[PDB]
Amino acid sequence: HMSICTSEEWQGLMQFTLPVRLCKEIELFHFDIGPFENMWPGIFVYMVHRSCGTSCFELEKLCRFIMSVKKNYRRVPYHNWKHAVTVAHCMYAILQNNHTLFTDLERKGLLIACLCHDLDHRGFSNSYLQKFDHPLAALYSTSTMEQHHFSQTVSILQLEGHNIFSTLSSSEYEQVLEIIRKAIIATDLALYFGNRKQLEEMYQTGSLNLNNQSHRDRVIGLMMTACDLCSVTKLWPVTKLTANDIYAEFWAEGDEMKKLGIQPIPMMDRDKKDEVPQGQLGFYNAVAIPCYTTLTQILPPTEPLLKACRDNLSQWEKVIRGEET
Ligand SMILES: Cc1c(N)nc(C2CC2)nc1Cl
Ligand SMILES: [Mg+2]
Ligand SMILES: [Zn+2]
């Protein structure tokens, strides 16, 4: 079952107003929510109200939904409430800059999918769950955690007073749940490689057509990867601090494996931290740079993400060369 927020929590959120000085900052792709922890639920309400409107959702239901989602993120080093709001902010910046390409249903579904995309993450990878035959891997054979995050999103919507989508027609309700399911499953990095390869081929051959639902689904999937990996698009000190959290979580998985008698892969071994800069250079070359390159080709307003990713790749190269630590 899903944890539920308290009345004090959602009522407090209903009263929040964003300081006007932050309006200019929140619109920027490089915005880092880090320094504003108490404002994170309020920043999410602000982004939903800007993209979709103050009357898109019943305010009481939206505040209960957000505070219950926060309560169902766990105290893990990386896949936590901060990550959820960071990914939702990147989606907000992408949607704001490509507004007319997305329907009202898609913008509301994608912001909610981003806030919920790692719901109830336990700090263990799909690799761990599958290798050790965890019951989640029996229920969900592929994209294990992602299917769980979607099931948890539906469970929160089913809590009394939390169904923010109940006012949609029956056809739009089904459509928004499908947008959310596909977007959350797209955050499984195993699916990204094939998705990006298909999109690059569609773009290069001139067959990419945003009026085609299957092509829209793929573009949305790439947008979800771009948002999920957006710590690589922040200013260097922020990118480096988030990388410490990414590895702290993977090292705890590696420690658990060692206790269970299985040697972890080097990335998850805290005794192999010296290999992190080369691991990051590999991740940027194989995953991040191609992701933002293809995204910028399809959605030119997203170019700042690619520029920042390239800047951070250069910083990791400087670390390898001993110019930075
Ligand atoms: C964003 C992100 C991510 N999801 N996973 C990694 C693995 C340690 C390589 N690095 C980054 Cl930078
Ligand atoms: Mg995830
Ligand atoms: Zn994530």
Domain boundaries, the chain: 1-325
Token code pair at residue 292: 């933002």
Cβ–ligand 1 distance for 233 under 6 Å, the answer no
Binding positions for a divalent metal cation: 83, 117-118, 228
Token code pair at residue 95: 């949607």
Asked whether 68 and 5 are in contact (CB, 8 A), the reply is: yes
Distance of CA 294 from the midpoint of ligand 1 (Å): 19
Nearest alpha carbon to residue 284 among 324, 248, 318, 322:
318
Nearest alpha carbon to residue 312 among 241, 235, 246:
235
Nearest alpha carbon to residue 219 among 302, 298, 305, 129:
298
CA distance 160 to 307: 44
Cβ–ligand 1 distance for 229 under 6 Å, the answer yes
Nearest alpha carbon to residue 16 among 48, 38, 1:
38
CA distance 92 to 12: 23
Strands (E), the chain: none
- State which approach was used to obtain the coordinates: X-ray
Rounded to the nearest 5 degrees, what angle is found at the Cα of 73, between the Cα atoms of 43 and 46?
10
Binding positions: 79, 83, 117-118, 228, 280
Ligand positioned closest to the Cα atom of 186: 2
Cβ–ligand 1 distance for 43 under 6 Å, the answer no
Closest protein CA for atom 3 of ligand 1: 229
Q: Please, what is the angle between helix 213-228 and helix 289-298, to 10°?
A: 140
Q: Please state the CATH superfamily assignment of the domain spanning residues 1-325 in this structure.
A: 3'5'-cyclic nucleotide phosphodiesterase, catalytic domain (1.10.1300.10)
Give catalytic status of residue 89 as yes or no. no
Closest protein CA for atom 7 of ligand 1: 283
Q: Of the residues 30, 49, 79, 148, which is catalytic?
A: 79
Ligand 1 atom nearest the C-alpha of 280 is 9
Asked whether 13 and 42 are in contact (CB, 8 A), the reply is: yes
CA distance 231 to 246: 10
Q: What are phi and psi of 159, to 5 degrees?
A: -70, 145
Binding positions for 3',5'-cyclic GMP: 79, 280
Cβ–ligand 1 distance for 225 under 6 Å, the answer no
Distance of CA 206 from the midpoint of ligand 3 (Å): 31
Token code pair at residue 111: 């912001």
Q: How many C-beta atoms surround the C-beta of residue 227 within 10 A?
A: 25
Nearest alpha carbon to residue 81 among 147, 49, 27, 37:
37
Alpha helices, DSSP H, located in 5-80: 7-14, 21-26, 40-52, 59-71
Q: Which residue has the tokens 């989602």?
A: 69
CA separation, residue 168 to residues 108, 151, 263 (Å): 11, 20, 50
Asked whether 240 and 36 are in contact (CB, 8 A), the reply is: no
Ligand 1 atom nearest the C-alpha of 229 is 1
Cβ–ligand 1 distance for 232 under 6 Å, the answer yes
